[PDB]
Amino acid sequence: YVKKPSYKIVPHFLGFNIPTVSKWIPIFGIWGAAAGIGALFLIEGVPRTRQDILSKIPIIGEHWIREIPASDNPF
Template identity: 35%
Template sequence: MVSYISQLTSKSAGRFNFKGMAAIAPDLFLWGGAWAASLMVFTEGWPRFQSTLYEKIPYFGQHWVDNTPAEDKPN
């Protein structure tokens, strides 16, 4: 006969509470910032990301605007 367990028996799941989340929040912000920075580094040369995201960043967006005259472009 099969017996079913009605509750989670693993203690590794733990409980989510404010104190526990407040303790790991700085680490989550640090790793989230590192993830966002690495995403920006790896996608900086992609034209679609340049026109969609990076050109719209205030003050720094002008770095990705292409001001090359049409006669100097290879197309």
Template identity: 35%
Template sequence: MSFQSPVLREYPSYKSPYGPKYHYQPHVGGYTFKQIARLGLRASAFGGVALFGVIYYASGIPRVKKDILQKIPFLGGYFIDHVPASDNPF
């Protein structure tokens, strides 16, 4: 076991004012909060586009029209069918 010499214990080590300023950077699992926020933003954008695609693809299904699309404010009236029940194949 080695100990510092008494001379080194009295004087702190020199730190240059022009050197790098190191500080603790908080992280979760190795990812910084900035990286997590950026990843969350990208994931939500892709998820929103995917949700729009699924709803657009399923918009021809009558149950989707009635339960989901007709309840959207300002756009719900567009999805109401004005076709008589005798002419509707569904």
């Protein structure tokens, strides 16, 4: 015979609990990647982005190492 139902209250805050949030952790990850890729794409033209980030990527990085010949540069 059972006298009482068996349950606990899980900690919660602003209507969130850990079981639920944990399901969304990976999704925040992918959104973070999406935001990272998007941000980096937006500043791909900035010379510092190329110098510090993009030109350092293996294989691919040579796409961003481009020199104007000194004969063609007024400045």
